[PDB]
PDB file of C-alpha atoms in Angstrom:
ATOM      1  CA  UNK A 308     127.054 101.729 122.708  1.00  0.00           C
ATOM      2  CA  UNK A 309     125.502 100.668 119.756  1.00  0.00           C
ATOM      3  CA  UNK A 310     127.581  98.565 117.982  1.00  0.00           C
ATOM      4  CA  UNK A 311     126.457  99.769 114.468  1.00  0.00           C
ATOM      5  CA  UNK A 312     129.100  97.886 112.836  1.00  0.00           C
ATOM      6  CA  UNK A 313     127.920  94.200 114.234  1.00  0.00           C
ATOM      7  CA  UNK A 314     131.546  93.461 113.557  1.00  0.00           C
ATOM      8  CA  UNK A 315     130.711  89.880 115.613  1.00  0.00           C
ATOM      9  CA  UNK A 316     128.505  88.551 113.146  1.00  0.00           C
ATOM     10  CA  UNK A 317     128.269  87.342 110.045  1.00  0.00           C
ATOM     11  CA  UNK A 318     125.981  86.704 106.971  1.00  0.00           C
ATOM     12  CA  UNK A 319     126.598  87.189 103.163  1.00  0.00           C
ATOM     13  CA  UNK A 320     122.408  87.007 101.662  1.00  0.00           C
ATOM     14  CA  UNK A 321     121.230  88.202 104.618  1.00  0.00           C
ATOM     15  CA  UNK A 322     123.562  91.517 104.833  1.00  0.00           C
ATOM     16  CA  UNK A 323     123.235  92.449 100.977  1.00  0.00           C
ATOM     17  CA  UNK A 324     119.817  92.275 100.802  1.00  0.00           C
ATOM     18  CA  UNK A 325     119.463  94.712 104.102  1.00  0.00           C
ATOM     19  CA  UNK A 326     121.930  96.741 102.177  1.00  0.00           C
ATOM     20  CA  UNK A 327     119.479  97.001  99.199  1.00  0.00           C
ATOM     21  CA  UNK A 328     116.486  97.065 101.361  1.00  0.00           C
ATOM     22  CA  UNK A 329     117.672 100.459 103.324  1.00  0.00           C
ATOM     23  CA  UNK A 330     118.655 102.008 100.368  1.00  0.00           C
ATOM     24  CA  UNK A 331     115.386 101.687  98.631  1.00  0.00           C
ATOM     25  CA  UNK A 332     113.051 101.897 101.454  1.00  0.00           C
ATOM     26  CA  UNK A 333     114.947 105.306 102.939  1.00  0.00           C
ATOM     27  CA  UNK A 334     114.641 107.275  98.933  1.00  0.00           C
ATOM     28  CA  UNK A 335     110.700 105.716  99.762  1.00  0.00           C
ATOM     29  CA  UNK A 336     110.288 107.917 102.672  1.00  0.00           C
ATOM     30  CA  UNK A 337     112.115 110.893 101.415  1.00  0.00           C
ATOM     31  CA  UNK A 338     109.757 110.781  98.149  1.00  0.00           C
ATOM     32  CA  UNK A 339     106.732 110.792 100.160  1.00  0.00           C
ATOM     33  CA  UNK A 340     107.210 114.572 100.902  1.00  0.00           C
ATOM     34  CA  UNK A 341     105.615 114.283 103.761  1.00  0.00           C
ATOM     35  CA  UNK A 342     104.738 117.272 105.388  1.00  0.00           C
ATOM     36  CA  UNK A 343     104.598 116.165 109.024  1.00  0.00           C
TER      37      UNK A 343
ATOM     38  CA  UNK B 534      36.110 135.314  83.667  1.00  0.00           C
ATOM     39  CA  UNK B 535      35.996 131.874  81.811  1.00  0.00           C
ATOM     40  CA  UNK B 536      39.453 131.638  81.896  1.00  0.00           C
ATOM     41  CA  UNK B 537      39.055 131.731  85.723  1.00  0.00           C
ATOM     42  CA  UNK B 538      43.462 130.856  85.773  1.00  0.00           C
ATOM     43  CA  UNK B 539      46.224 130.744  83.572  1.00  0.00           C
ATOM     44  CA  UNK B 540      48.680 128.758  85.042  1.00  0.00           C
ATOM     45  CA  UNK B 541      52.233 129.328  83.439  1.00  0.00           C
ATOM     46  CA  UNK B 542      54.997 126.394  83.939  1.00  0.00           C
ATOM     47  CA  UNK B 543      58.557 126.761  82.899  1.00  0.00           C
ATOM     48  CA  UNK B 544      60.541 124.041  82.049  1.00  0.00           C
ATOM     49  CA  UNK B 545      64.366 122.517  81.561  1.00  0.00           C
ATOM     50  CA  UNK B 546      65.782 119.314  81.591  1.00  0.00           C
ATOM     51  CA  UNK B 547      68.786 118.507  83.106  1.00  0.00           C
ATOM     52  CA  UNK B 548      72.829 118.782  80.702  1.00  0.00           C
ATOM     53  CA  UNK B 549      74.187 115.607  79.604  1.00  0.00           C
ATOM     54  CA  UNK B 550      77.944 114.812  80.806  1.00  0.00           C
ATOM     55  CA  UNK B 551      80.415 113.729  78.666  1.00  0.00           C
ATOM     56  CA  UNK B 552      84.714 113.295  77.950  1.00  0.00           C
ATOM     57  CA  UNK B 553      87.106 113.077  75.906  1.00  0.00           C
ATOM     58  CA  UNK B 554      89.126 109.896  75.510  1.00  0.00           C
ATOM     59  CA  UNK B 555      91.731 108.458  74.347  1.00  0.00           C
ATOM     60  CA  UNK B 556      92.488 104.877  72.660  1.00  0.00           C
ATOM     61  CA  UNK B 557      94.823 102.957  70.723  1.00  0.00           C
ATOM     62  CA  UNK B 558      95.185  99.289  70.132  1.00  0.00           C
ATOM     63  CA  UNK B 559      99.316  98.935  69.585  1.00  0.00           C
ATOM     64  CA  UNK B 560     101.473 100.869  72.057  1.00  0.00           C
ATOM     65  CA  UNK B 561     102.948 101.584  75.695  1.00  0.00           C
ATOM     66  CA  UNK B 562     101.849  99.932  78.733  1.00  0.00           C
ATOM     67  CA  UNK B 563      98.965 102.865  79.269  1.00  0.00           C
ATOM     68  CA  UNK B 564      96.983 103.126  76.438  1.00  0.00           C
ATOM     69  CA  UNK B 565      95.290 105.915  76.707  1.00  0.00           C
ATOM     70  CA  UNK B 566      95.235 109.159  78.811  1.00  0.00           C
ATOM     71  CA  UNK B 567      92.624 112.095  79.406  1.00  0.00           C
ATOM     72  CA  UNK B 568      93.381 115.224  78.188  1.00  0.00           C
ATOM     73  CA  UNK B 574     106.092 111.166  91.536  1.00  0.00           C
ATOM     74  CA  UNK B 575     105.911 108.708  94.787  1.00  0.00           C
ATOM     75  CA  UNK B 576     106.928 105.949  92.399  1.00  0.00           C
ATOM     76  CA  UNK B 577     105.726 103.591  95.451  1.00  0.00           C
ATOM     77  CA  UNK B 578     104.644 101.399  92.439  1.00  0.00           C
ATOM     78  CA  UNK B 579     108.881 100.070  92.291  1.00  0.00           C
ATOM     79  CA  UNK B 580     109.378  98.775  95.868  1.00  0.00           C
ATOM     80  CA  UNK B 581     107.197  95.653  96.123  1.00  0.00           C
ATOM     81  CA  UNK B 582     109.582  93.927  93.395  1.00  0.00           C
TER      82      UNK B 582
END
């Protein structure tokens, strides 16, 4: 169990912003090319 | 033999380095250039 959803919880500012922040740091990562 | 020695020397000084540049006073953010991480986004 995970519990990816975090369904007991709450947070409006805190929740969009890790929304953005995945978003932009995951197309980061992919961008780097790495070859590793 | 007066001329008991003849020494011969040759000689060559070294090339000088140089570029082309560009420059302009109005325009884009980089002015000039010589003649795709885009890292530079995520700290804002």
């Amino acid at each position: 169990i995970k519990d990816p959803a975090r369904d007991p919880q709450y947070a409006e500012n805190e929740v969009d912003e890790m929304r953005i922040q995945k978003d932009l740091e995951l197309e980061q990562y992919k961008r780097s090319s790495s070859k590793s | 033999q007066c001329n008991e020695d003849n020494v011969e020397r040759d000689i060559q000084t070294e090339e000088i380095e140089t570029r082309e540049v560009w420059t302009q006073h109005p325009g884009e953010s980089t002015v000039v250039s010589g003649g795709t991480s885009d890292a530079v986004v995520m700290p804002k």
